[PDB]
């Protein structure tokens with residue numbers, strides 16, 4: 001046997017991975033293999049595989065059986081491009097030892113993590129694992145620690161995207177907590193530390209695999225997964241589209257792409273969206289879609305914390321991040337869940353030089369013991385902090401309500417904002433007329449007459465605007481034009497801040 | 508228009524260049540009736556639509572050449588977006 005024959009035989013096995021029968025089962029279950037997923041994700045022919053001939057070196061529990069050797073050791077690693085842009089990937093292969101993590105497994109992932117940080121290219125992981133490989137013991141625990149160290153080091157340096165394409169258990173479930181976005185596949189992917197078998201054995205509770213850690217739970221209730229997609233093919237198609245929004249590294253400006261949508265057009269549809277009656281809700285998404293280039297908007301966590309909307313869009317070709325209230329849900333109030341999603345999004349966009357647009361319509365915070373005992377104070381500070389420390393352009397437009405401390409939390413001008421616009425329907429006050437007048441004229445006669453005078457003078461955006469809180473009051477139809485003008489001149493903005501080893505977020 | 512065919516052709520063009528979005532409209536019905544062979548010839552009675560659409564309105568039916576044009580347009584537009592997606596300012 002020549003060396004070339006041995007090489008060819010290893011190449012053929014590396015492509016089969018766990019073997020054809022395992023691959024057959026992989027398809028029966030409605031899943032693609034790790035290599036098929038990469039072929040879909042990356043530009044055709046752009047993928048270059050690294051370390052395809054690496055095998056484990058572990059010899060306990062008869063693991064040294066040649067029948068227990070598999071080239072690639074359960075991960076496919078390499079580099080490629082999406083639409084001409086460099087990206088690093090890795091994908092875990094469930095058909096080889098259940099996708100469990102070995103020492104060598106982690107080493108290969110770390111290698112990719114180090115090359116991407118050095119050059120400044122994003123890393124996209126496709127995760128699917130049964131947890132640690134118990135046959136090696138403590139070697140796999142060091143594997144996790146090294147991966148975690150790279151994921152922390154890369155934070156704020158390169159984007160880190162993690163798409164879950166199957167179950168994930170043990171220590172593996174923490175890597176999506178360190179990356180920037182986590183995506184899942186409905187009814188296929190899971191995230192949990194221990195399985196239902198442990199829950200039943202430890203405590204008298206009955207739960208199944210979907211209820212404990214299914215995609216629907218994490219995208220609707222726990223707030224862990226940013227979005228779930230119907231199947232593997234649609235998940236990767238949307239991932240390519242998402243990729244096109246982000247810079248390659250934090251040293252780069254927000255990408256600018258060819259755009260055919262005139263930057264100076266008006267949107268007459270905005271003038272009548274906001275009702276004159278204060279108790280009538282409207283859909284904030286109608287405003288967002290009409291302003292953004294070609295009416296394309298990428299919504300994050302559509303089913304979690306619906307009272308606040310965050311997502312990506314482009315204006316005049318440039319990627320921007322959008323944050324705003326949704327008056328339809330809980331009157332547009334802030335609560336614990338909305339502050340968590342908001343602060344996380346704002347901080348990512350600031351780290352990677354993506355401008356922020358804020359659409360404010362917030363009457364205050366969600367009252368009640370459910371929020372008080374939940375630490376609403378500690379959690380609300382997260383969104384205020386995320387805006388106050390931002391150094392990227394911030395353009396705020398107030399569409400209607402801004403009462404109380406929520407005015408400042410939703411990126412008010414006095415938090416180093418660049419511009420602040422009000423629509424004619426905006427009203428900025430410490431509280432509404434009823435509270436303010438009954439407190440001011442407490443115990444006085446003819447309070448209702450005093451309230452009429454108070455409403456005429458203060459129930460409008462003018463007592464704030466004349467003091468410098470608002471830069472202009474614009475016809476809503478011109479909102480897009482005004483924002484476009486600001487974005488194209490604030491893009492060269494640079495500011496300094498006192499040196500600090502690191503930031504200290506309230507947590 | 509100056510004649511019966513000019514006014515009908517111009518109507519067909521106006522309907523395809525008439526943008527209504529946000530509600531459900533009846534342009535599909537108007538665009539097919541005006542091009543119906545009985546309408547162009549004039550064999551129209553007050554119960555015309557009830558005999559043409561005895562089972563309800565189904566939408567415009569494509570022939571062989573029209574399906575090829577629709578497939579070619581949809582495929583070329585798909586690629587046009589795929590090519591635009593690759594044109595970045597050079598970093």
Ligand SMILES: CCC(=O)SCCNC(=O)CCNC(=O)[C@H](O)C(C)(C)COP(=O)(O)OP(=O)(O)OC[C@H]1O[C@@H](n2cnc3c(N)ncnc32)[C@H](O)[C@@H]1OP(=O)(O)O
Nearest residue numbers: 097098100129130131132133134167168169170171172195
């Ligand atoms: C907390 C400590 C950490 O850091 S992670 C600790 C690791 N412990 C685990 O996750 C337990 C492993 N199993 C589970 O968690 C769940 O039951 C899983 C496997 C995720 C449910 O997936 P399910 O679709 O039922 O797969 P399965 O159990 O049929 O396994 C598929 C094939 O893979 C294998 N496999 C699985 N896990 C391991 C592992 N840790 N080490 C070695 N092999 C593993 C299974 O034996 C199975 O192979 P086969 O089908 O029996 O030929």
Ligand SMILES: *C(=O)CCCC[C@@H]1SC[C@@H]2NC(=O)N[C@@H]21
Nearest residue numbers: 331333363364365366367404434
């Ligand atoms: C009705 O008259 C009173 C409504 C309750 C007050 C509301 S609830 C949400 C806003 N936040 C706040 O502190 N007060 C407002």
